[PDB]
Design an enzyme around this catalytic site. Structure first.
Site, short mmCIF file in Angstrom:
data_model
loop_
_atom_site.label_atom_id
_atom_site.label_comp_id
_atom_site.label_asym_id
_atom_site.label_seq_id
_atom_site.Cartn_x
_atom_site.Cartn_y
_atom_site.Cartn_z
N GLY A 140 18.75 31.38 20.00
CA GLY A 140 17.69 31.04 19.08
C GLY A 140 17.80 29.63 18.53
N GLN A 141 16.76 29.20 17.81
CA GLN A 141 16.74 27.85 17.25
C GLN A 141 17.95 27.60 16.35
OE1 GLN A 141 13.09 25.72 15.77
NE2 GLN A 141 13.95 26.22 13.76
N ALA A 182 9.94 35.24 20.68
CA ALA A 182 9.89 36.58 20.11
C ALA A 182 9.03 36.69 18.86
CB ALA A 182 11.30 37.09 19.81
N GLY A 237 13.30 36.42 15.79
CA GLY A 237 13.24 37.47 16.80
C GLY A 237 14.32 37.33 17.85
N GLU A 287 11.59 38.86 7.89
CA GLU A 287 13.00 38.54 8.07
C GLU A 287 13.94 39.60 7.52
OE1 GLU A 287 12.48 33.66 8.17
OE2 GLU A 287 13.70 34.59 6.60
N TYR A 335 16.91 20.77 8.00
CA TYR A 335 17.81 21.55 8.84
C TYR A 335 19.01 20.73 9.28
CZ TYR A 335 15.11 25.86 9.46
OH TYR A 335 14.48 27.06 9.27
N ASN A 387 22.74 21.96 8.86
CA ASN A 387 23.53 22.17 10.07
C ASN A 387 24.80 21.32 10.06
OD1 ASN A 387 21.59 23.94 10.88
ND2 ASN A 387 20.82 22.70 12.58
N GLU A 408 43.65 37.45 15.89
CA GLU A 408 44.30 37.22 14.61
C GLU A 408 43.31 37.11 13.46
OE1 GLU A 408 47.62 34.30 14.79
OE2 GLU A 408 47.20 33.96 12.67
#
Ligand SMILES: Nc1nc2c(ncn2[C@@H]2O[C@H](COP(=O)(O)OP(=O)(O)OP(=O)(O)O)[C@@H](O)[C@H]2O)c(=O)[nH]1
Ligand SMILES: Nc1nc2c(ncn2[C@@H]2O[C@H](COP(=O)(O)OP(=O)(O)O)[C@@H](O)[C@H]2O)c(=O)[nH]1
Ligand SMILES: [Mg+2]
Ligand SMILES: [Mg+2]
Lengths: 427, 430, 244
Positions: A9-10, A92, A137, A176, A217, A221, A247
């Site tokens: 996904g994006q 989606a 989606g 969502e 974004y 990110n 671990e």
């Protein structure tokens, strides 16, 4: 050794861009995959061509070519082989059932095949690191489908999640909460460890500490990639704490369903007085404003606490700060837990994107704590879910894409049980 | 989810459709010759949605349909009439006589196969067909009758693609016939079960706006179609410019349609400018927000005070403080929480586009799925029953094949739609 | 006006279909040479695909009364009919959105099936329709397929294993279909297959490949069936059974 990263996904793809960009900066790898160092620990994330080219062990999947096209066009077009960049044509549409049942099933065999290629280029495959969103989606539907198929094929190996918890500040869909509950249910028995990232927490940390009035974004990110680097650094560099994926469960997962740690990173300083000590960055890990999932650990009980230091950090300065915090704050452990902090140190400085929004720091720390207070995030999702599902709003979209309506009830019953399981372990 | 096939049917369909193509071809920097003469590169970022190539310039992906060749020539004689594909004009020469049955059953069915051939042609040159878009009038004969037939025909040949419509509502204030309630009722009966989303464009609202707001004593169709082309340009902004929220047709429908039959939207926008040159108001963000959520700017004769908003999609255009937009959009919500559904969290969604419409610097388009839209159907249902109790003018529909039961079913399903819109207007969170 | 059954204007075509429906109900039974609609079955195969939904409905009800009219010896020519007629019946009769146009098309498929010797030379023609774009078509003709098994059943069919496997091939795809009605009508078809065989068979062959929520539904559906494991009688007989 080797670890295959999967970006769905994006959100998964765009974050993988910021992560692999930071991975190359930390390891000194150039966009063309070449490194100037003649005469590992980082080979767990990269492979080596016979021509001396270092290629990430990553797969980028999307049901729409738009985002991944920018990858095979921007600065790192030569870093990945085009066989690792998989796209469909129809996405989606923020619908789990489309990503998991209708559209996603027409690309599942193609994705698993390109993954088997990477898995066959490895001698000792540790497992997978899945990057996806909760609300989309593809990030919810297709990811849960891939997690079902990886448990069948690569049953013995571990699978880690870096999920993007939704937030209305940047929410691109109303349903969502539906997608979040549906993917968390079908992935719960396949995921060994899942690091949720509340977009609201990253959004507010960018506003507060970076003084960004409206984070993009790219801001979120780059901040997220800083944390993901601190978590995976134990795999890319030879250290003591969290040297393999098995671990992570041993140190943070006391029960298979309670595999949602809470990450707290510090310091996050804008690029515009002086360096922070070990005690100050360790104190900031217990300020909920520095968490990546909005919740109050003071309203919960701990089951694990790991301090992943990196930079100019001396062990005696760590134990001095820990002893101060342990006797100056309220860290409630369950009365059946080793109550002891685990500390890993990586003497390489924290790398940032050049010209970016984060300033280079002498030292930093990322705390991985498994607390029951993270169940507050499940409550905020379960509530928004309950409001709409009580009216069956937007349900016809999912039923019209191969989903039986009873699967909504099953997924909500599981989240109801998961909230009970957090309550029980809590007290 | 990329290319959108556009269709215009009937007199009103080709009128508002041609005006819509004039508006967006200018915003995308396309002259009637088809060439690109714009400046910014955002205008070409997502030009593949509505236009094609000729490699010798850009050509609209539009199909023009009518049972009467009169509007065919008035469109080609228009300023942008030379840009449309010649083969995309599908016109019969008989007519519909403002009869829904003639367009849906009799003489529109004998022409619909010619349209689906042009529909099929434009769909093959699509890398990934996103959906369809129809402009028509529910009170007429061709756009109402043949339009709903085209929708049902596209539905059975493209069951994957979104079906979106721009349907205008008949009104006695600007009416051409008495059987408009019949045609609108029979047409709404189709849209409620065939279209994924439908923008209600009430002519009674458009008339009241031209008369009581723009202060025009005798509004013409050009005065009404100016508000339509502006409203259509706004609700399609997120589709042709690079945005994040409500990018394609399905994602918009997934956010706006909580229940399948409740896909009838109440569009509005601000500021309300006349057909003059330009205004000097230069509206601020708090003004654009107050004007958007005001009944005087709704393209549908319904008072939002009488119903609750299920879902809302706001679209701002022009350079402005996006931070100042959130404060206003959050304000109107928590200050009027009674008019917003509680059991749908975060039902209002706001998008921003840097490019304004040509002539203005700041504008804002509103898309609301309000339960007050039942007033519009109540109004049409009132006029329908007033004639249907005595079966007046029914012989023209029965003479074209329709059984009398079809009227009873369409009337019943419309009243069911009204009751459902009232049903969720009364549901609570408790 | 017999040739106006393919006239340009619809109302003339609609009239001929009604005139035909009267002929087939008001004519001889021994039959006129004028009733030469057996030996040229492309005539009604063209009427069923009438471009006018109203006159198309009348061409089907006329085909229906014709189809029961031909239930008079010696018309073994019913093999040529099924090949030419039930593909138009399935493609544009069962697919039709009109509840009356579809109800009579299902009634014609029933008559054309009992004109046969078994159900196989009728299943093989509407099996390709199970993979159509339009879900309403595959929703409708899987319900039809399920009702030609409920009433007729697998008797006198050449190789049942070739027919069982042929109809069990798309069932996993049909039960995962995006449409809610396609899935729902496939669960009903599974019940019909369950009623003629046991439960052991389609668990060996099918039930394992369905969603667990689905095979729980079928278990609930199997409990609500009270009749014997195979029905001790066909709810509907073929034509050759009602004779000898
Ligand atoms: N932090 C961050 N979150 C993102 C980013 N992109 C998307 N998201 C989140 O992802 C959610 C929406 O899902 P997407 O990933 O955009 O959708 P998708 O995975 O492409 O699947 P589709 O619905 O088919 O488009 C929203 O809640 C966003 O907040 C990103 O670049 N950074
Ligand atoms: N707003 C607007 N409405 C129109 C226009 N032309 C027709 N109408 C409306 O459409 C209805 C008549 O349908 P019309 O399109 O003329 O007949 P058709 O060609 O058979 O669809 C009347 O109620 C008119 O108010 C137009 O240009 N603008
Ligand atoms: Mg996407
Ligand atoms: Mg007119």
């Amino acid at each position: 050794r080797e670890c295959i990263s999967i970006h769905v996904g994006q959100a998964g793809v765009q974050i993988g861009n910021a992560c692999w960009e930071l991975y190359c900066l930390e390891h000194g790898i150039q966009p063309d995959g070449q490194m100037p160092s003649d005469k590992d620990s980082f080979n767990t994330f990269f492979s080596e061509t016979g021509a001396g080219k270092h290629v990430p062990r990553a797969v980028f999947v999307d049901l729409e070519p738009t985002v991944i096209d920018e990858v095979r066009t921007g600065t790192y077009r030569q870093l990945f082989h085009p066989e690792q960049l998989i796209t469909g044509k129809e996405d989606a549409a923020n619908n789990y059932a489309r990503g998991h049942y209708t559209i996603g099933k027409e690309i599942i065999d193609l994705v698993l095949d390109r993954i088997r290629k990477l898995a066959d280029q490895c001698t000792g495959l540790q497992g997978f690191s899945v990057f996806h969103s909760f609300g989309g989606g593809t990030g919810s539907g297709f990811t849960s489908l891939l997690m079902e198929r990886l448990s069948v094929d690569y049953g013995k190996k571990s699978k880690l999640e870096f999920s993007i918890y939704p937030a209305p500040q940047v929410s691109t869909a109303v349903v969502e909460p539906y997608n979040s509950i549906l993917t968390t249910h079908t992935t719960l028995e396949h995921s060994d460890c899942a690091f949720m990232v509340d977009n609201e927490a990253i959004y507010d940390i960018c506003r507060r500490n970076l003084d960004i009035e409206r984070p993009t974004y790219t801001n979120l990110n780059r901040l997220i990639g800083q944390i993901v680097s601190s978590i995976t650094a134990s795999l890319r560099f030879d250290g003591a704490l969290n040297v393999d994926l098995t671990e992570f469960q041993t140190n943070l997962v006391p029960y298979p369903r309670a595999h949602f740690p809470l990450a707290t990173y510090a310091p996050v300083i804008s690029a515009e007085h002086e360096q922070l000590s070990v005690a100050e960055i360790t104190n900031a890990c217990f300020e909920p404003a520095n968490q990546m999932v909005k919740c109050d650990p003071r309203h919960g009980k701990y089951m694990a606490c790991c301090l992943l230091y990196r930079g100019d950090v001396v062990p005696k300065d760590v134990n001095a700060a820990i002893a101060t915090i342990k006797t100056k704050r309220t860290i409630q452990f369950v009365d059946w837990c080793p109550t002891g902090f685990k500390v890993g140190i990586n003497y390489e400085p924290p790398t940032v994107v050049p010209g970016g929004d984060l300033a280079k720091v002498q030292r930093a720390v990322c705390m991985l704590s498994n607390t029951t207070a993270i169940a507050e995030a499940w409550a905020r999702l379960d509530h928004k879910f309950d409001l709409m599902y009580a009216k069956r709003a937007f349900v016809h979209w999912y039923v019209g894409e191969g989903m039986e309506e009873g699967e909504f009830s099953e997924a909500r019953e599981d989240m109801a049980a998961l909230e009970k399981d957090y309550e029980e372990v809590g007290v | 989810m990329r290319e959108i096939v556009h269709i215009q049917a009937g007199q009103c369909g080709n009128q508002i459709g041609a005006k819509f193509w004039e508006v967006i071809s200018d915003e995308h920097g396309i002259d009637p010759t088809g060439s690109y003469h714009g400046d910014s590169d955002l205008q070409l970022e997502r030009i593949n949605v509505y236009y094609n190539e000729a490699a010798n310039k850009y050509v609209p992906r539009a199909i023009l349909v009518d049972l009467e060749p009169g509007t065919m020539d008035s469109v080609r004689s228009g300023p942008f009439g030379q840009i449309f594909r010649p083969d995309n004009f599908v016109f019969g020469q008989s007519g519909a006589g403002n009869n829904w049955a003639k367009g849906h059953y009799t003489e529109g069915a004998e022409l619909v196969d010619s349209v689906l051939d042009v529909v099929r042609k434009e769909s093959e040159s699509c890398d990934c067909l996103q959906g369809f878009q129809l402009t028509h009038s529910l009170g007429g004969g061709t756009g109402s009758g043949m339009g709903t037939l085209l929708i049902s025909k596209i539905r059975e040949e493209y069951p994957d693609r979104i079906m979106n419509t721009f349907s205008v509502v008949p009104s006695p204030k600007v009416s051409d016939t008495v059987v408009e309630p019949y045609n609108a009722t029979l047409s709404v009966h189709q849209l409620v079960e065939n279209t994924d989303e439908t923008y209600c464009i009430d002519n009674e609202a458009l008339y009241d706006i031209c008369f009581r707001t723009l202060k025009l004593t005798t509004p013409t169709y050009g005065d009404l179609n100016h508000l339509v082309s502006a409203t259509m340009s706004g609700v399609t902004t997120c589709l042709r410019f690079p945005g994040q929220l409500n990018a394609d047709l399905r994602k918009l429908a997934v956010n706006m349609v909580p229940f399948p039959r409740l896909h009838f939207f109440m569009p509005g926008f601000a500021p309300l400018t006349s057909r003059g040159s330009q205004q000097y108001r230069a509206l601020t963000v708090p003004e654009l927000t107050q004007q958007m959520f005001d009944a005087k700017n709704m393209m549908a004769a319904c008072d939002p005070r009488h119903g609750r908003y299920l879902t809302v999609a706001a679209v701002f255009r022009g350079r402005m403080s996006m931070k100042e937009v959130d404060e206003q959009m959050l304000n109107v919500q928590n200050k009027n929480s009674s008019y917003f559904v509680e059991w749908i969290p975060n039902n209002v969604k706001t998008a921003v586009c840097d490019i304004p419409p040509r002539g203005l610097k700041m504008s804002a388009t509103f898309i609301g799925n309000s339960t007050a839209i039942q007033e519009l159907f109540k109004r049409i249902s009132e006029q329908f029953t007033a004639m249907f109790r005595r079966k007046a003018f029914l012989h023209w529909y029965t003479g074209e094949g329709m059984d009398e039961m079809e009227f009873t079913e369409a009337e019943s399903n419309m009243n069911d739609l009204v009751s459902e819109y009232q049903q969720y207007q009364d549901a609570t969170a408790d | 006006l017999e040739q106006r059954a393919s006239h340009k204007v619809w109302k003339a075509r609609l009239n001929a279909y009604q005139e035909l429906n009267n002929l087939f109900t008001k004519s001889s039974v021994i039959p006129n040479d004028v009733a030469n609609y057996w030996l040229d079955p492309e005539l009604f195969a063209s009427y069923i695909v009438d471009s006018n939904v109203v006159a198309q409905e009348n061409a089907i009800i006329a085909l229906h009364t014709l189809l029961e009219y031909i239930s008079q010896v010696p018309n073994v020519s019913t093999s040529k009919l099924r090949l030419q007629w039930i593909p138009p019946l399935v493609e544009k009769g069962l697919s039709s959105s009109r509840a009356a146009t579809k109800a009579k098309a299902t009634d014609c498929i029933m008559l054309l099936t009992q004109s046969d010797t078994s159900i196989q030379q009728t299943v093989n023609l509407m099996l390709p329709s199970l993979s159509n774009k339009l879900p309403r078509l595959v929703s409708s003709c899987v319900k039809c397929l399920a009702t030609i098994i409920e009433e007729f059943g697998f008797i006198n069919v050449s190789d049942i294993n070739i027919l069982l496997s042929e109809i069990l091939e798309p069932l996993p795809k049909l039960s995962s279909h995006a449409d809610r009605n396609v899935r729902s009508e496939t669960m009903n078809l599974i019940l019909q297959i369950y009623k003629w065989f046991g439960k052991e068979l389609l668990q060996e062959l099918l039930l394992e490949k369905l969603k667990p929520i689905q095979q729980r539904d079928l278990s609930r559906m199997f409990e609500k069936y009270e009749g014997t494991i195979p029905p001790k009688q066909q709810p509907r007989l073929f034509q050759w059974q009602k004779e000898q």
